[model samples]
Target: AEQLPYFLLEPQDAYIVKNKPVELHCRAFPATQIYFKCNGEWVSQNDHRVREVQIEVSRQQVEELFGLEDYWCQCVAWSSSGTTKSRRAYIRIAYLRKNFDQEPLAKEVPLDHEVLLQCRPPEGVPVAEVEWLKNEDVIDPAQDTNFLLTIDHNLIIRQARLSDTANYTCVAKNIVAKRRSTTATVIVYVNGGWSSWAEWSPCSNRCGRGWQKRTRTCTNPAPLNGGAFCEGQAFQKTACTTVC
Candidate 1:
């Protein structure tokens, strides 16, 4: 029997919390022996991720609520040959309680340098807050027009010091859910000399100053104590007089 154009529908940008109510749905050419695919892995009927929905010809189908974090699930139609179809309904879950161990690794660096950490929550997320942290305290970075906080993903340091060394983290939260982590320790080595601050680690030293050291310039307006190079002649009444 000829089938309609193959399309994996439903779970249409559907969102769900870890413990809250959730409905997952999918549509294909023919709904028969439908198998669910989750996070790029084939799922079993016994698996909890494959939320069993009331199957119908077409339209939205409601499934049992699932508890998974950043979950990407889709429905697959198993053909008579016992092979799966090509269509997929991609979904990203935001579990109410985040798994710290599975979170992305947080990295630290010098203040003057650039930070490229990203908080990506897939395409369908309506609201998600991505931010940095210092010692478990939130670092309310400034924002511009395009981004929530500062447009630039930068952690610039005008002047770096030893105090900048601390535990750094990133938190991504949203209206429907909240996920945090990427915890790491950042130790910035502040060079006391003349140069721009940059990233350095205890394992090895980063390159030193790029420019030459500078000397102060002397502008002469001719003071009263001008040209007397005497050790004890600090104060004198003579005005702009040169003594040999």
Candidate 2:
């Protein structure tokens, strides 16, 4: 029975840096001819009859061959009986873009309410790591029970407090570079409350029929951090009578 070619070594996923050479290796036993395919096109110049094959991809070659799409490569070995192919390997450009796909938006939340700040990191090869900052300071979820960092890189503040109001930002990092998202301001507000009504003032007219007024202010707990102002009339008046 004729022997069929089988690969001993196959190309693996690679993260390629700018202006750097990438190497893909392939080896097969009992093979008469071996060649590589990149993006489904045969690498004719790199074909070999030996059992071992190595292809060195230059930056110039990659730029012209793959263009902007991702680079995928595989190897094929031919024997007297049949041809065998190896698994495809992906080649990624190691980089991180400056802009984020989604940034946390400015939010105004009431005190003691739950607040969620969402963020989507910039695109990058090999995936990027995400972290959050508050007022330019890194937020530590372990240090504060009220804060939680989600797997998707979102920040959750349970029961927001007045101190929670601050500027927030999300940072993304990879082996190639790091990027910071636009700043987002979070405001934790306290609603205003009315103070006690003041004593009624003397009648405007001391004769036949007059009106006395009582007034109140929102000084009890004034609105803060973009909170809503007290809603309702601040003063009341009633008719009064006096003989002059």
Candidate 3:
């Protein structure tokens, strides 16, 4: 068997945000030269940003090394046996800015109805403020009872009125960064009714492969006052398989 001093312990991957306290740990079976590195330079125990301290066993902890970017640690053992160094461990940082998992998009709703606009972000961000805006004006939830804002950045419209319709936007900010989401347009439309489709008419030809259809009309206060048209087709058909 090959001669060796000890097994090198590699640190696990790290994820941290900028300007936050972080720790990276490395260990080896047999203690030797233990040190940490940030950006390819050996870390000094006397440095203010990085504190290298031996806790218990062969484990060494490096604090504040991940304040910004990548860092690594290695344990080297040398003696009559060949020397060995621990594999490099990587550290990465996720953005501090707010991110929306699902953004509110343009939509339409009937008058006198309730609507909810929602925004979701990553769970890592601990401190953040969410704001809602309409036409570039901040919406004060304290001003109106109907306009409500949730801690998770959800905007609720209790009873949609014509005045409530606008291009709404969502914003999120933290101590490190700020982000804005795309605008969502809410169209308030008057209520409309659809006439029932006439009973399925008799098969056009009471024969094989014949087609039959029924039609309906959008009357009862047809699509007026910004109301959207019924999306689906007004007529439908199926093939008749029976012989005359």
Report each candidate's C-alpha RMSD, comma-separated, in the order given.
Answer: 18.0, 7.2, 16.7
Question: How do these models rank on TM-score, best leading?
Answer: 2, 3, 1
Better of 1 and 3 by lDDT: 3
Tens-place lDDT per residue, model 2, 53-99, is: 77866666656754677778899999988999999988776777888
lDDT of 1 by residue, 1-244 (tens): 4443254555455444444444456555544556556656655534241223421111111232345444456666644444344444434443333543233344445445444434333222454456666677766535321113344333333343446566656565666655656666655543222222223222221343222222221222221212222222222231222223
Q: How do the candidates rank by lDDT, highest first?
A: 2, 3, 1
Look at candidate 1 and give me any clashing residue pairs. 70-93, 71-93, 111-157, 142-150, 143-149, 143-150
Single out the weakest 10-residue window by summed lDDT for candidate 2.
Answer: 41-50
Better of 1 and 2 by lDDT: 2
Where does candidate 1 have its weakest 10-residue lDDT segment?
Answer: 54-63
lDDT of each: 0.43, 0.85, 0.64
Q: How many Å off is the CA of 233 in candidate 3? A: 21
User: Where's the lowest-lDDT run of ten residues in candidate 3?
Assistant: 49-58
Per-residue alpha-carbon lDDT of candidate 3 for residues 173-236, written as tens digits (9 for 90 to 100): 7555776788999988876577888998887776666778889877765875578666567888
What would the C-alpha RMSD of candidate 2 be, to one decimal place? 7.2
